[PDB]
């Protein structure tokens, strides 16, 4: 519900003097947003759900190639009409056989032949569509207020601390104004619009593994099929029958079912979890505008922490050009601001490392409290420092 630790994270500084920012959220991704003199926050899309799909086509892999028929016609006696031609009970196809006396016929030459095999379906590689009112989005907003390695990921704690929230967005009401206590509030206006990927892609269903395929690769494929009826067309895939037989029996070999034809075109189409009636979009995106002129700092009237500060371990690399670390405050005094900055060289006057966790501060007055901090240090070597003078501690770091 917050960004820290995720690999799909993006940091943003809306604009210059901007109280709002335009953004893009997607499936498993998160976004951290910074704004002068205001708390940092993380907008993140949690879930995509349909809280009403419809089938479109249905290619089969098949069985019933059991019953046979061979309406025979002697030479010059014309064509052969198999009674199994009145109902789709079977699939018929004509041919001719060299014959004559040898096999009961009076003259010698080509005789008509019209055999038939039966057709019903087994494993239907079903597929459906995704109309662009049942689409609801679930966006979670976090606030980079005081935290600890511990509480940073606990949704509960955070909600309790009024430093988090999880609301939904719908085409009905595409916006929301999430209130965060003394931090004011953030109001998103996400626009359900998405491509994201356009509905243009079909909904491929294969046994258990659902996938998202291109309208055409799908529609324009070679396999028996049926729309919404028990009636099947193009069952011609009941092939490899024409051993070009005798009037007695035309081998109707069931065409070998090779799931390779499908599987092979796996990677192309994106995979997606699908329950009987639902398709969780990950495929999908959402353009939002994080208006936040109502987002406000807190604990700004407090004094600076003036007591020792100890590191609780080597800072860690987030893999995003920022590092994380947790402090401990020897301080007995209450909620005070944490004097931490990033200095290019010991005892420099001006900072150089911007803090993600802006305006940090010991939440409680209960001495030895922990403080989590994420900050982006400058490239190359630098120093993280907390406190000043002879209280001040430090730890070096080198970005690349």
């Amino acid at each position, epitope marked *: 519900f917050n960004c820290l630790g995720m690999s799909n994270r993006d940091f943003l500084e809306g604009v210059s003097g901007a109280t709002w920012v335009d953004l893009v959220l997607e499936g498993d991704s998160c976004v951290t947003i910074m704004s002068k003199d205001k708390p940092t926050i993380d907008v993140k899309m*949690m*879930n995509m*759900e*349909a*809280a*009403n799909l419809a089938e479109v086509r249905s290619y089969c892999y098949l069985a019933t190639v059991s019953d046979l028929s061979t309406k025979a016609a002697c030479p010059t006696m014309g064509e052969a009409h198999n009674d199994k031609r009145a109902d789709p009970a079977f699939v018929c196809r004509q041919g001719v056989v060299d014959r004559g006396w040898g096999n009961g016929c009076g003259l010698f030459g080509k005789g008509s032949i019209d055999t038939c095999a039966k057709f019903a379906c087994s494993t239907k590689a079903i597929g459906r569509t995704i109309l662009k*009112e*049942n*689409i*609801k*989005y*679930e966006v979670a907003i976090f606030v980079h207020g005081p935290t600890t390695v511990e509480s940073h990921g606990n*949704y*509960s704690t955070q*909600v309790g601390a009024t430093q988090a*929230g*999880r*609301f*939904s*967005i*719908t*085409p*009905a*009401a595409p916006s*929301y104004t999430l209130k965060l206590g003394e931090y004011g509030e953030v109001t998103v206006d996400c626009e359900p619009r998405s491509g994201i990927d356009t509905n243009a892609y079909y909904v491929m269903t294969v046994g258990t593994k659902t996938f998202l395929v291109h309208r055409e690769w799908f529609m324009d494929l070679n396999l028996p099929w049926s729309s919404a009826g028990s009636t099947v067309w193009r069952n011609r895939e009941t092939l490899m029958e024409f051993e070009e037989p005798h009037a007695t029996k035309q081998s109707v070999i069931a065409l070998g079912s090779q799931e390779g034809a499908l599987h092979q075109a796996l990677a192309g189409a994106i995979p997606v979890e699908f329950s*009987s*009636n639902t398709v969780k979009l990950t495929s999908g995106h959402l353009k939002c505008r994080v208006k936040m002129e109502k987002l406000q700092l807190k604990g700004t009237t407090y004094g600076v922490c003036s007591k020792a500060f100890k590191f609780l371990g080597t800072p860690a690399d987030t893999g995003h050009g920022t590092v994380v670390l947790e402090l401990q405050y020897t301080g007995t005094d209450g909620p005070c601001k944490v004097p931490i900055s990033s200095v290019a060289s010991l005892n420099d006057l001006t900072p150089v490392g911007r803090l993600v966790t802006v305006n940090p501060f010991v939440s409680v007055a209960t001495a030895n409290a922990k403080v989590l901090i994420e900050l982006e240090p400058p490239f190359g070597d630098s120093y993280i420092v907390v406190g000043r003078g002879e209280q001040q501690i430090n730890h070096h770091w080198h970005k690349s």
Partner: antibody, heavy 123, light 111 residues
């Protein structure tokens, strides 16, 4: 799978109020409306209202307007129904039911039903 | 008093077809699609039919719904003992601006 677990059976005197809970799981809580429907013993179903867990907006049955209140807690995925000024005629099994998935109040209908909570109003 | 009108009781023998009517008005069934719920004894209702004639997964084809003007109907073929239950029709009502129900039909399966 969608699961809705309601609070236990209750008894109340006429004039009192009752607050029934419905704990949801197995789906994204704030993406689906929640309906309440009640059924007096041996009688038919009566829709009571609907709440949007996103934002908390409600629409109530006209006949209950003024003494029913629906609320939700999004952190605990729980919806509540409170009915006040109870009378004997409010004796019923009270069901919460997740909506099918409408993105609008219009055309919503209950699809996944909780187990029900029997509330008896008696002197 | 319910907004949609159903027979209080329908009965049939195992294997037969039975139907359950549901009569409404232009403001509900006439304009909007009908849903049906099945409520087995001692249990919560479950959705049986939606959108006049659509079945949720798991509901067998011998349950079928239809709508004609301001009335709707549920047909149950191949009646089974386990079908004994209360059945409710439902629809959105434009005039009341909310979902309405029929009074319910108790389906009994005879010997």
């Amino acid at each position: 799978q969608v699961q809705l677990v309601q609070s236990g059976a209750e008894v109340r005197k006429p004039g009192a109020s009752t607050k029934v809970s419905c704990k949801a799981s197995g789906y994204t809580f704030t993406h689906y409306y929640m309906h309440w429907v009640r059924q007096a013993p041996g009688q038919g179903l009566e829709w009571m209202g609907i709440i949007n867990p996103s934002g908390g907006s409600t629409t109530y049955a006209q006949k209950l307007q003024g003494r029913v209140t629906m609320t939700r807690d999004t952190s605990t995925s729980t919806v509540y129904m409170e009915l006040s000024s109870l009378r004997s005629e409010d004796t019923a099994v009270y069901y919460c039911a997740r909506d099918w998935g409408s993105n609008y109040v219009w055309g919503s209908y209950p699809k996944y039903w909780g187990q029900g909570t029997l509330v008896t109003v008696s002197s | 008093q319910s907004v949609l009108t159903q027979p209080s009781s329908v009965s049939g023998t195992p294997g037969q077809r039975v139907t359950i009517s549901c009569s409404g008005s232009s403001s509900n069934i006439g304009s909007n699609t009908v849903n049906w719920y099945q409520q087995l004894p001692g249990t919560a209702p479950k959705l049986l039919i939606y959108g006049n004639n659509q079945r949720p997964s798991g509901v067998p084809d011998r349950f079928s719904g239809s709508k004609s003007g301001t009335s709707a109907s549920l047909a149950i073929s191949g009646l089974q003992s386990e079908d004994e239950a209360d059945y409710y029709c439902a629809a959105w009502d434009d005039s009341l601006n909310g979902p309405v129900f029929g009074g319910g039909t108790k389906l009994t399966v005879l010997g």
